[PDB]
Every structure is written in C-alpha cells, then in structure tokens.
CSV table of C-alpha atoms and ligand atoms in Angstrom, one decimal:
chain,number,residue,atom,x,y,z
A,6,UNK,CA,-112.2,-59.0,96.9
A,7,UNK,CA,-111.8,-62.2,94.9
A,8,UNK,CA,-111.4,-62.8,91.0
A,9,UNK,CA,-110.8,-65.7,88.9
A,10,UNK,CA,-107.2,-66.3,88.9
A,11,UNK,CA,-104.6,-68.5,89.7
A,12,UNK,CA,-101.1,-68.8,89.2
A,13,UNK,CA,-97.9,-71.4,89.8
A,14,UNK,CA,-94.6,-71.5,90.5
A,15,UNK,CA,-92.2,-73.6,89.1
A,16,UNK,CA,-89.8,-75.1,92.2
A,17,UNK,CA,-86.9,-76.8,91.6
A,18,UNK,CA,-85.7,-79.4,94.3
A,19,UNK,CA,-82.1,-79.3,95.7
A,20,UNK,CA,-81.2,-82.8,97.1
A,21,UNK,CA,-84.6,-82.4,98.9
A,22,UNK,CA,-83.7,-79.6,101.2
A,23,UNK,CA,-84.0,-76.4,99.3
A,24,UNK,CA,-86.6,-75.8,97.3
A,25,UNK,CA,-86.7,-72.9,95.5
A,26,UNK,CA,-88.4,-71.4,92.4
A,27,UNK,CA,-88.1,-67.6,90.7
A,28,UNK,CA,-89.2,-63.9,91.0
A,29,UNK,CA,-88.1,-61.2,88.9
A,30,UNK,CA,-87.5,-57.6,90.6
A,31,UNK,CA,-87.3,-54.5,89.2
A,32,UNK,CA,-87.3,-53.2,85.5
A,33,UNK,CA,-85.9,-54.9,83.7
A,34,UNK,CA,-86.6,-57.8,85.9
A,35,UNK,CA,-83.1,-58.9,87.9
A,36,UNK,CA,-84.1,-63.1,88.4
A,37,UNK,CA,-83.6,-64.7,91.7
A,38,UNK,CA,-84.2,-68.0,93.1
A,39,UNK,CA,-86.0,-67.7,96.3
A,40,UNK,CA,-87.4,-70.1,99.2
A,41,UNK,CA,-90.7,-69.1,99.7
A,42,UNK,CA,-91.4,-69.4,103.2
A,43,UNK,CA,-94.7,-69.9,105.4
A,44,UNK,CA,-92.3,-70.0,108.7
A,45,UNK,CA,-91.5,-66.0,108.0
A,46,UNK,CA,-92.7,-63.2,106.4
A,47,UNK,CA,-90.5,-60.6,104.7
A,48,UNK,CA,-88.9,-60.6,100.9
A,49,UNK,CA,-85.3,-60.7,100.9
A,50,UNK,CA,-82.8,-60.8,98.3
A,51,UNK,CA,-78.9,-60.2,98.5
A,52,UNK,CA,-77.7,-56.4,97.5
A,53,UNK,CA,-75.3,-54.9,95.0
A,54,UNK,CA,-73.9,-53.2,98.2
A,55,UNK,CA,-73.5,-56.1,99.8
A,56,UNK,CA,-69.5,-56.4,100.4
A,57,UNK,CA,-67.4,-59.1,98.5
A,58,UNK,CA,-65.7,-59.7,101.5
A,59,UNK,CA,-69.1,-61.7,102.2
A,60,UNK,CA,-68.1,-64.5,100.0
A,61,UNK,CA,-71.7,-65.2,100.3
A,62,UNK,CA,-72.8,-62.5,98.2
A,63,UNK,CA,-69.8,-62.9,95.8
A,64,UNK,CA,-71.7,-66.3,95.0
A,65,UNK,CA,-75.4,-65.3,94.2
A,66,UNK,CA,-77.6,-63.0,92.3
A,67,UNK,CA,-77.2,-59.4,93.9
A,68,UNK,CA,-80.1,-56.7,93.5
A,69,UNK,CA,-79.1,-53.6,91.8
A,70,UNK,CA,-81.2,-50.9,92.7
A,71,UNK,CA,-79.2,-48.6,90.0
A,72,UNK,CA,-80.2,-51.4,87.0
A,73,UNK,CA,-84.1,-50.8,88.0
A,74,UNK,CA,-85.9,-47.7,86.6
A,75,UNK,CA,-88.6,-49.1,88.9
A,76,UNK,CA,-86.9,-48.6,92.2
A,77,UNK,CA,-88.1,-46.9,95.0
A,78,UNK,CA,-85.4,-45.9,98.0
A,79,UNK,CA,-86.6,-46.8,101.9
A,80,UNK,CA,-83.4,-47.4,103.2
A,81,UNK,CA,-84.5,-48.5,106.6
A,82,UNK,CA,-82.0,-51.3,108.3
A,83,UNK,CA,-83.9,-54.6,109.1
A,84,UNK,CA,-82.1,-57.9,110.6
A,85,UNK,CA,-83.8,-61.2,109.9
A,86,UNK,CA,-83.0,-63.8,112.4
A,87,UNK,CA,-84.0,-67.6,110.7
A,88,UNK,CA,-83.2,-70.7,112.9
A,89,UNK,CA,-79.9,-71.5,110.8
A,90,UNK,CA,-78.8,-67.8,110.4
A,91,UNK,CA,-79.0,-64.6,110.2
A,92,UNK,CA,-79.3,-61.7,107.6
A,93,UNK,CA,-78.7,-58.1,107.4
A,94,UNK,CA,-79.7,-55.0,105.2
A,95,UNK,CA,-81.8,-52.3,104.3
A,96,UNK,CA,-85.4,-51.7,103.0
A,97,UNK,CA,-86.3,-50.8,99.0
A,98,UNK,CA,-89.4,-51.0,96.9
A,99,UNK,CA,-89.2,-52.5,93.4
A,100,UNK,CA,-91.7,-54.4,90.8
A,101,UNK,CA,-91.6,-58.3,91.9
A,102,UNK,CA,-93.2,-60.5,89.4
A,103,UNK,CA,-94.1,-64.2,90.6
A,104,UNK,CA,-95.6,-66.8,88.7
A,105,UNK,CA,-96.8,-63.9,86.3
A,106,UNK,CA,-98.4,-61.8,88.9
A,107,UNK,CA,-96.8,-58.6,89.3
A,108,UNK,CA,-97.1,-56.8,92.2
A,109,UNK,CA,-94.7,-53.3,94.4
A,110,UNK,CA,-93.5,-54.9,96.9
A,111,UNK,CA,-91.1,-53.5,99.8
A,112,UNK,CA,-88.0,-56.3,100.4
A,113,UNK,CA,-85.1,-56.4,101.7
A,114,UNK,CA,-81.6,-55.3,100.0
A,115,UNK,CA,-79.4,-57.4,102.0
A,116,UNK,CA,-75.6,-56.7,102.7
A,117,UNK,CA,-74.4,-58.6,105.3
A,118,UNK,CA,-74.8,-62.3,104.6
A,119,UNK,CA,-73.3,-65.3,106.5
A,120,UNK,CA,-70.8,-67.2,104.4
A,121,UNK,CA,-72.4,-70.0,106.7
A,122,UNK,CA,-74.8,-70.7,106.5
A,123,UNK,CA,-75.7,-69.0,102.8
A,124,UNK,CA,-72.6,-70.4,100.8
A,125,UNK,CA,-74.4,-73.5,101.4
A,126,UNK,CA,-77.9,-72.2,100.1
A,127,UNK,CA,-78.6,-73.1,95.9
A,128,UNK,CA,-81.5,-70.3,96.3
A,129,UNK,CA,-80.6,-66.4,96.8
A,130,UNK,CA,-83.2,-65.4,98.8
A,131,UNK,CA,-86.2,-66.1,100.4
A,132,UNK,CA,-89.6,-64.9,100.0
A,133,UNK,CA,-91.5,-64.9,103.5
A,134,UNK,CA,-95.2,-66.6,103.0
A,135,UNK,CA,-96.1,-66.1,106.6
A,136,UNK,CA,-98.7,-63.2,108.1
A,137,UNK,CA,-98.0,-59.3,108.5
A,138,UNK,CA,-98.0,-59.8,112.3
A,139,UNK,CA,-94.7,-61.4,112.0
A,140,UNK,CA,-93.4,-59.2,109.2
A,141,UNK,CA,-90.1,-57.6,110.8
A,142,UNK,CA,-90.7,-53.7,110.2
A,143,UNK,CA,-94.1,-54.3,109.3
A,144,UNK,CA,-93.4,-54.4,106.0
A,145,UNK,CA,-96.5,-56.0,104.0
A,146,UNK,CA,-96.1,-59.2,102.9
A,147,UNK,CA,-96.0,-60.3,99.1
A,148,UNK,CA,-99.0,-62.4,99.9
A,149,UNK,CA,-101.0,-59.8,101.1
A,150,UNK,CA,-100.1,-57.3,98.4
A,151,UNK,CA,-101.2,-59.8,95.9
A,152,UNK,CA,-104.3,-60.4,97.5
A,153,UNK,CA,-105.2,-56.5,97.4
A,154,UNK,CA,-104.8,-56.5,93.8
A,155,UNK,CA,-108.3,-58.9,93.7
A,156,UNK,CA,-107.0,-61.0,91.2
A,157,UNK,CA,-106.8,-64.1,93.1
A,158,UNK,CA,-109.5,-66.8,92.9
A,159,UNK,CA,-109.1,-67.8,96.8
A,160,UNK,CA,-107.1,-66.2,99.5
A,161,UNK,CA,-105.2,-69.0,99.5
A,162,UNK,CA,-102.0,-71.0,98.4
A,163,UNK,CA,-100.7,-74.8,98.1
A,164,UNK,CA,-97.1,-76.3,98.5
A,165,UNK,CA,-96.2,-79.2,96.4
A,166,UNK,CA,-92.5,-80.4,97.0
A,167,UNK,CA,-91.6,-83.9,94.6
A,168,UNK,CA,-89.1,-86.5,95.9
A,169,UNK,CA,-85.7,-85.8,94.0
A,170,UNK,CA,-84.3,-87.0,91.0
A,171,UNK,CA,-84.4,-86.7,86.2
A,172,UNK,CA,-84.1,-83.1,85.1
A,173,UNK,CA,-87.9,-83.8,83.5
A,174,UNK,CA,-89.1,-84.1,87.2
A,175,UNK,CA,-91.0,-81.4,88.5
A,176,UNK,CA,-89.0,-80.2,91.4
A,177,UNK,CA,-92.7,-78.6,93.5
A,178,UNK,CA,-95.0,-76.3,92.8
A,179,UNK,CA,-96.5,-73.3,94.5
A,180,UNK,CA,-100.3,-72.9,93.4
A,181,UNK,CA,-101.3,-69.2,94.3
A,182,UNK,CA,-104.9,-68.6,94.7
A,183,UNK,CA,-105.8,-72.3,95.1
A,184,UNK,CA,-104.6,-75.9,94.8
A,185,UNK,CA,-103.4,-78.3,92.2
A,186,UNK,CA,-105.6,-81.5,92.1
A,187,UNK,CA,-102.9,-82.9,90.0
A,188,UNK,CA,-100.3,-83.4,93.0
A,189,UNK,CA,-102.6,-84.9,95.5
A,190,UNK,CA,-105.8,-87.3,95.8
A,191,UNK,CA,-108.1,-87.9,98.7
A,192,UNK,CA,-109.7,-84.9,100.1
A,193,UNK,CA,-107.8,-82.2,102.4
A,194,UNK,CA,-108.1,-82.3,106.1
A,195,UNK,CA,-108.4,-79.4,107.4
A,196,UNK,CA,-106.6,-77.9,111.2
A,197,UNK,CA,-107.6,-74.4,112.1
A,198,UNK,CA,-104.9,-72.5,113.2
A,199,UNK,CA,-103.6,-71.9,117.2
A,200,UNK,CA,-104.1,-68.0,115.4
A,201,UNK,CA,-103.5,-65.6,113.3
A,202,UNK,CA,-100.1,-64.5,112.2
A,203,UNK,CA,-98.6,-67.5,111.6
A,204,UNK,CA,-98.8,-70.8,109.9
A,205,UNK,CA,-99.3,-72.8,113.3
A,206,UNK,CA,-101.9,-75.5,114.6
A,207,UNK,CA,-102.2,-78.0,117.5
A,208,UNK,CA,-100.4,-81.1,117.1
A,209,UNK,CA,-102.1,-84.3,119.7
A,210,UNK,CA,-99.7,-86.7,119.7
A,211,UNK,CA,-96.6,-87.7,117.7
A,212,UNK,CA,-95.9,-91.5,117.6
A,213,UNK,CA,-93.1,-93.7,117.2
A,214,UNK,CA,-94.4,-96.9,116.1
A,215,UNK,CA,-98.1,-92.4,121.6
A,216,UNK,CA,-94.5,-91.4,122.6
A,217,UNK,CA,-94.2,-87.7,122.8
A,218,UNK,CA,-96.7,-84.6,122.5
A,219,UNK,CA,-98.8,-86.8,124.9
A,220,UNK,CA,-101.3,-83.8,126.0
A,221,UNK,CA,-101.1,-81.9,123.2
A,222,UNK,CA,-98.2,-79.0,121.7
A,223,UNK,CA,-97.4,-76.9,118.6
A,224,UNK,CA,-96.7,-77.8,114.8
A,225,UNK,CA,-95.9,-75.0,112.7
A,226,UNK,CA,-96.1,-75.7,109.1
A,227,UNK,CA,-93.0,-74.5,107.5
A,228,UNK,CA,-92.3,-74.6,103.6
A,229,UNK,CA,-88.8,-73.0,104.2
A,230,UNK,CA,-87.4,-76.0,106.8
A,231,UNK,CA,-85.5,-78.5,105.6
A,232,UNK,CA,-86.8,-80.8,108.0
A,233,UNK,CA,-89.8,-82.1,110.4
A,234,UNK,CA,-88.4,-80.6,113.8
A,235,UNK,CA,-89.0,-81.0,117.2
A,236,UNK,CA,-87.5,-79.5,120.6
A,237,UNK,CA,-84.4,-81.2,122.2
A,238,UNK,CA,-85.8,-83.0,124.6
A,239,UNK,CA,-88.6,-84.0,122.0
A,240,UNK,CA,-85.7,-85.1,119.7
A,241,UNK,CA,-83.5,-86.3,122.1
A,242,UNK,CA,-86.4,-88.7,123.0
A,243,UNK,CA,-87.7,-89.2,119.1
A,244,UNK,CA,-84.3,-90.6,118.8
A,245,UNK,CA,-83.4,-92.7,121.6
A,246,UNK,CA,-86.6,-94.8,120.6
A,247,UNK,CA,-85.6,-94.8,116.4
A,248,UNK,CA,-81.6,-96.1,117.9
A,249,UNK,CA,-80.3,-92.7,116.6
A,250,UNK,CA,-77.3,-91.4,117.3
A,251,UNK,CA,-76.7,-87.6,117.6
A,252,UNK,CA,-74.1,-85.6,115.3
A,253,UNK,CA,-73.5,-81.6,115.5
A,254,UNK,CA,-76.1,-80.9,112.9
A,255,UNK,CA,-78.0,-84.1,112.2
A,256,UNK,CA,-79.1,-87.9,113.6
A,257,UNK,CA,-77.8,-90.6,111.9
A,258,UNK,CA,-78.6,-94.5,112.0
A,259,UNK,CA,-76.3,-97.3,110.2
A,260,UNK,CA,-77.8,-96.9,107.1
A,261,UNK,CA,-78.1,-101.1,106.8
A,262,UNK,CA,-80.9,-100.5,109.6
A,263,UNK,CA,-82.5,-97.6,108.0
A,264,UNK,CA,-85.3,-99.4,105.8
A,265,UNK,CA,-86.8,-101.6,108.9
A,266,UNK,CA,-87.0,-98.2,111.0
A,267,UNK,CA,-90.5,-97.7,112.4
A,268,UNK,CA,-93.1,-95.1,111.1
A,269,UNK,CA,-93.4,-91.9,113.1
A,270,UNK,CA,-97.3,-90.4,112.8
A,271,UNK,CA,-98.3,-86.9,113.8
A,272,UNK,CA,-101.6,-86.5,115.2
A,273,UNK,CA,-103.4,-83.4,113.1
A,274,UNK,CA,-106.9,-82.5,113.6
A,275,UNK,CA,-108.9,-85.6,113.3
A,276,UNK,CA,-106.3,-87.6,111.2
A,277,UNK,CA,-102.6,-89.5,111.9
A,278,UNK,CA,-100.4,-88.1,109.1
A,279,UNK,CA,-97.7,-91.4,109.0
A,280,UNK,CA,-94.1,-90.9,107.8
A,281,UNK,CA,-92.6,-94.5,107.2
A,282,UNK,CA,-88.8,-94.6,107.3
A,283,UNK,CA,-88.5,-94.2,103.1
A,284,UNK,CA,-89.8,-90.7,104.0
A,285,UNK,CA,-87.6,-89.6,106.6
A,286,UNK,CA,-84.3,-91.6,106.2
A,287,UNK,CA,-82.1,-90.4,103.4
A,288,UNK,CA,-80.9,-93.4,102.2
A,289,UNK,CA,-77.6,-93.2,100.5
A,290,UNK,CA,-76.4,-96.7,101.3
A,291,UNK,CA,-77.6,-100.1,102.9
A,292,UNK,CA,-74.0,-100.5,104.1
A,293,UNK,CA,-73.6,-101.7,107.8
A,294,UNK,CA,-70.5,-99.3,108.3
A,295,UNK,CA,-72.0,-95.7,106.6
A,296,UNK,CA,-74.5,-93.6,108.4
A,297,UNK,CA,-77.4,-92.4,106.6
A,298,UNK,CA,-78.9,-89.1,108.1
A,299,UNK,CA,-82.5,-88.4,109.2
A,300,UNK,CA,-84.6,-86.0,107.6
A,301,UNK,CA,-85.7,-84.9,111.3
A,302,UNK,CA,-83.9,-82.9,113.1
A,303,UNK,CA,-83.3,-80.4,117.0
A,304,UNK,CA,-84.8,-77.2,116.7
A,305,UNK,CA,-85.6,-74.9,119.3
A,306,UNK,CA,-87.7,-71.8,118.0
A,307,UNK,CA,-87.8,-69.4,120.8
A,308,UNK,CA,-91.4,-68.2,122.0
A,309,UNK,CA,-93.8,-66.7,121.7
A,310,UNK,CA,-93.9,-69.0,118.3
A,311,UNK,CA,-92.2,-71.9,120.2
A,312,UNK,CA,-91.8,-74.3,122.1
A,313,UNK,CA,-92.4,-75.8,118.5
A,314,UNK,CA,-92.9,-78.7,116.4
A,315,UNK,CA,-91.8,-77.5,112.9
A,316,UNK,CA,-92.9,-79.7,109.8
A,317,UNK,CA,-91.2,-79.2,107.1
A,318,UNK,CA,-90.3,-80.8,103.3
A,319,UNK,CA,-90.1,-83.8,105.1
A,320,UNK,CA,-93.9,-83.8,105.8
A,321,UNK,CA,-95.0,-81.7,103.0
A,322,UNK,CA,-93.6,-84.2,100.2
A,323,UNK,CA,-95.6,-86.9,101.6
A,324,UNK,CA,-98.8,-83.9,102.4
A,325,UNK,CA,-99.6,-81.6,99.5
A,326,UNK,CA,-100.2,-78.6,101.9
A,327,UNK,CA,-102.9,-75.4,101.6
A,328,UNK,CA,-102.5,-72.9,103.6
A,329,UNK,CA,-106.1,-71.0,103.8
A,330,UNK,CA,-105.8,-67.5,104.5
A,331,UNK,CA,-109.7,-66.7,104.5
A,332,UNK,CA,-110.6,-69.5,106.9
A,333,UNK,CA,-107.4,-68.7,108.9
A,334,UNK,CA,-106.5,-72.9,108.7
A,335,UNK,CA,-104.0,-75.0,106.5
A,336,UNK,CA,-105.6,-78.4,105.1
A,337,UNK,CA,-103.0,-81.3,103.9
A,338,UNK,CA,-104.2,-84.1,101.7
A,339,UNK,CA,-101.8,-86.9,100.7
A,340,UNK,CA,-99.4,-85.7,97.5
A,341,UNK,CA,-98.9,-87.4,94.1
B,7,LIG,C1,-89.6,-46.2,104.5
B,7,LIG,O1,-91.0,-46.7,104.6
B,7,LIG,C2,-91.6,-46.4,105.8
B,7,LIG,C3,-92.9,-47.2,105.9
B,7,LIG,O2,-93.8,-46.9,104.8
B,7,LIG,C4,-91.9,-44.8,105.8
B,7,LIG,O3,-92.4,-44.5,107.1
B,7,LIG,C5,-93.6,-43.6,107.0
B,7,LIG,O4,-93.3,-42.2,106.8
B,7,LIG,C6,-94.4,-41.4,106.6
B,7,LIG,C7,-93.9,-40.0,106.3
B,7,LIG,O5,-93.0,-40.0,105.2
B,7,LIG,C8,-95.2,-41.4,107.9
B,7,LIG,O6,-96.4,-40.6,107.7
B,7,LIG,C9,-95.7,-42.8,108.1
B,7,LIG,O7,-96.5,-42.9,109.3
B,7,LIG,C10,-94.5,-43.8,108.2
B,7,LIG,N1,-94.9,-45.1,108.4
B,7,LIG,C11,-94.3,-46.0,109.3
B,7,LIG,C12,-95.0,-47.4,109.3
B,7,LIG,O8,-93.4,-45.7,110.0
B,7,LIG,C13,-90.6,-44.1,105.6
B,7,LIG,O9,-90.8,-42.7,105.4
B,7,LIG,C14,-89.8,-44.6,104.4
B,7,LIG,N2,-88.5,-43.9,104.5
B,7,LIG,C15,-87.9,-43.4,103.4
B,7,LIG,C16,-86.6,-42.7,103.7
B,7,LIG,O10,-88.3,-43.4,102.3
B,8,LIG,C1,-77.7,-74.3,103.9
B,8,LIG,C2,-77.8,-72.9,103.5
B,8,LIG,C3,-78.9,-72.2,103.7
B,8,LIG,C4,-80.0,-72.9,104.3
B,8,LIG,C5,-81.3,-72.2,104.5
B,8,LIG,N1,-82.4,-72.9,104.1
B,8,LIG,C6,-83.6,-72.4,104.2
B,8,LIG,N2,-84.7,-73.2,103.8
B,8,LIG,C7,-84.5,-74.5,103.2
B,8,LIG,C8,-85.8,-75.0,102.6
B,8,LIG,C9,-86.4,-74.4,101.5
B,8,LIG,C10,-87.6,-75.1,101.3
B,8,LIG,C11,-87.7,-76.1,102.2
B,8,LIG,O1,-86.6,-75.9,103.0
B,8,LIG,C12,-83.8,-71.1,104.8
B,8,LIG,C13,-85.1,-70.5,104.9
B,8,LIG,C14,-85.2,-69.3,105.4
B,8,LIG,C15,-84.0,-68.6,105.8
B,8,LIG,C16,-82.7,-69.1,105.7
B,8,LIG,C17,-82.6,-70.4,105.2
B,8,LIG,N3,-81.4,-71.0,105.0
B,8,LIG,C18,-79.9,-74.3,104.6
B,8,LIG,C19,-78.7,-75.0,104.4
C-alpha cells in the first residue's frame, strides 16, 4: 500500500567518507548520528551497557534503554560482521523517528565495539538500508517497517552525497519514498538487480582509460562504503595501470601526478558511468614528494554476496542513486 508521502534526511559529510545524518530512539527521543547503509541491513546503535573499557563507546551517544518509557526488552545476542569491523550486542525494540517518520523498530543495543575501527567513525551507528534476507536475526528492516505503515509515496529511496566543504553546504540527503530532482539532472538509468535481498547488479566492464570485468561481474551499490571497491586482484590490476602504489589501507600516487590520471568508467546497464581523477584522487597537494590517496580501494566481501565490486561515495557523489524496492532495481542519474 502506497500514500502520498515523502520524507528527507539531512546528511552531513565527514571529509567525504562518512556520511551520516540523525534518528531519534525511544521516548524521549535519545539522537544518534547513523550511516544509513544499502550494503547491510540491521539498526544498530552503541548501548548504555556497553563497557567503558571500550573506549569506543566512552566516545559516542550510548542508548539507554532505562531513559525510554518506550522500550521493549528482546535481549537476543547478534554479531554484525562489516568489512572494516565488527560489532557486538543484544536485541531491543524502541520508537525510531527518521526524517519525521516514526516507526517500532527492533535494533541493536551494542556493547562490544572496536576501539578500531569505531574511534575513528564521526557517526554512532549505522542504520542498515539493505533487504530482510540479509537482516542478521531476521530482524525487519527500518525500511520495511516504514513501508507497512503505507505512508510512503513509492517503495523507494534516493542517496545524495555533496563533495565536502562551508558549514552552509549540504553534506547529502536521503529522500525516502522518492527522489530529489533538485540534486540530479538527466534522466535515471535504470539496472535491475542480480536479485532480491541485496542492493547488487551486473557490472560489464570497468575501464581504465576495457581493462578488467571483461565478461561481466558484480557491483553492489553501497551507501555505507567509503570507497568504489574492487577484489585484489581487480585492484591490484586497477592500480598497476593508474602507477599506484599500494599502502596497508590505501593506494597512493604522487599527488603532482594526480590531476593528469586517466578516467576509470564502469559499464552499468546500457550506460558507461566515468569517474575522472578529480572524483577519485583526494587531492591534498600537487607536491611531487606528498602522496595523495585514492578514493578506490581492496575489498574482498566473501560470497555468496562477493566476489564483488562495491561502489561506494565515491561513485554515488558523482550518481545521485535510487534504489527501487517495487521494481527490485536501483537507477543512477548524474548528481547536482
Ligand atoms: C525476541 O524477539 C523474537 C522475534 O520476535 C521472539 O521470538 C518469537 O517468540 C515467540 C514466542 O514468544 C514465538 O512464537 C515466535 O515464533 C518467535 N519468533 C522467532 C522469529 O523466533 C522472542 O520471544 C523475543 N525474546 C524476548 C525475550 O522478548
Ligand atoms: C573509520 C571508522 C569507522 C568506519 C566505518 N564506516 C562505515 N561507513 C562509512 C560511510 C558512510 C557513508 C559512506 O561511507 C561503516 C559502515 C557500516 C559499518 C561499519 C562502518 N565503519 C570507517 C572508518
């Protein structure tokens, strides 16, 4: 069932890898800055019984269950596994308002959070945007408890992230229910997904300068990664051709050579979606002897979701990105 609303969220952009915006849980509403996230699919937000000896949790806004006359105990443990870390807790229900919609919504308290990577997170929590089918526990997603409610004008939302900047900027924008014709022009291009339960289509070809994904692979379109990603050997190869050299973490290139790096293009559905080196190098110098970092990184997501091709802020700031839960496809058209 379908009505006639739509609402936003407000995202703020940290140094163009986190981009987060606010819920409010319980009564009265505790505030958290959240990643919301097509590449997973439960709520999470740190707990009051999280330990201090988690100097994670001693840094962000902790859920108090006893503060909510809302609250309603599960208790069951759940372990979310992301590709930069882990998290663990316990299940409870509670009032979440976003963007004005308010909906019960099971999430997890968690209490054992990584001081790396989460000292490092801006955001508190994450809010999983992806299907019930990955949903660890089963536990309904926020998405699909707001679309029971039959307030929503589409089965569908829209990811705008902006470039950084100053504090005027809009850091992004999540339109549930539809899209926001103010942040992209052209029309959307639409890619069915592989299936349903998760934010993934075919990719036909990546290009550096038809390089890799020659006979076709996997793009998962994911609104909580940092970064476009590739397997290893993908990246490996990516790189080799850009002149990149490899760090722990990250690829770097002299940051002097940077700006005449050549454009990398990802083959989706009908159309070649072009990155130019402005949208992937971060360039914090033109020096000869600093490196500047690429916004493309090594990741390899284990199956049955990978061997994948993730694309991430990287791709969505250039690709205002719907992701079309009625027509089970996501449609990209270019961002303003
Ligand atoms: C935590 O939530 C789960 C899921 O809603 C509850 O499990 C259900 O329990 C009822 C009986 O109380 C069963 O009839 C359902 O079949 C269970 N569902 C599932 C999916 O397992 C569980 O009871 C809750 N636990 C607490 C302590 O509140
Ligand atoms: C330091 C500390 C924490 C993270 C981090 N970042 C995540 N997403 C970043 C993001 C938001 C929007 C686009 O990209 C994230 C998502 C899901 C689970 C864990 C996560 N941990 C990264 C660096």
């Amino acid at each position: 069932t379908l009505g006639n609303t739509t609402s936003s969220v407000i995202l703020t952009n940290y140094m163009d890898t986190q981009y987060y915006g606010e819920i409010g849980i319980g009564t009265p509403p505790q505030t958290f800055k959240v990643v919301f996230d097509t590449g997973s699919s439960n709520v999470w937000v740190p707990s009051s019984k999280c330990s201090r000896l988690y100097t994670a949790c001693v840094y962000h806004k902790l859920f108090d269950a006893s503060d909510s006359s809302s609250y309603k105990h599960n208790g069951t443990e759940l372990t979310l596994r992301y590709s930069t870390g882990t998290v663990s807790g316990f299940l409870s229900q509670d009032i979440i308002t976003v963007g004005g919609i308010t909906v019960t919504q099971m999430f997890g308290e968690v209490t054992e959070m990584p001081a790396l990577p989460f000292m490092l997170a801006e955001f508190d929590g994450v809010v999983g945007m992806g299907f019930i089918e990955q949903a660890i526990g089963r536990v309904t997603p926020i998405f699909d408890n707001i679309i029971s409610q039959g307030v929503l004008k589409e089965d569908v939302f829209s990811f705008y992230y902006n470039r950084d900047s100053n504090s005027q900027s809009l850091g992004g924008q999540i339109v549930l229910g539809g899209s926001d014709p103010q942040h992209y022009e052209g029309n959307f291009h639409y890619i069915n997904l592989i299936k349903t339960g998760v934010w993934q289509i075919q990719m036909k070809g990546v290009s550096v300068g038809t390089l890799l994904c020659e006979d076709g692979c996997l793009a998962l379109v994911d609104t909580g990664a940092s970064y476009i990603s590739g397997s290893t050997s993908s990246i490996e190869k990516l790189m080799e051709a850009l002149g990149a050299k490899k760090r722990l973490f990250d690829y770097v290139v002299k940051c002097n050579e940077g700006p005449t790096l050549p454009d990398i293009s990802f083959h989706l559905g009908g159309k070649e979606y072009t990155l130019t080196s402005a949208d992937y190098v971060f360039q914090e110098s033109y020096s000869s002897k600093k490196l500047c970092t690429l916004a493309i990184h090594a990741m390899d997501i284990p199956p049955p979701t990978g061997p994948t091709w993730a694309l991430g802020a990287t791709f969505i700031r250039k690709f205002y990105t719907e992701f079309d839960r009625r027509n089970n496809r996501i449609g990209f058209a270019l961002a303003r």
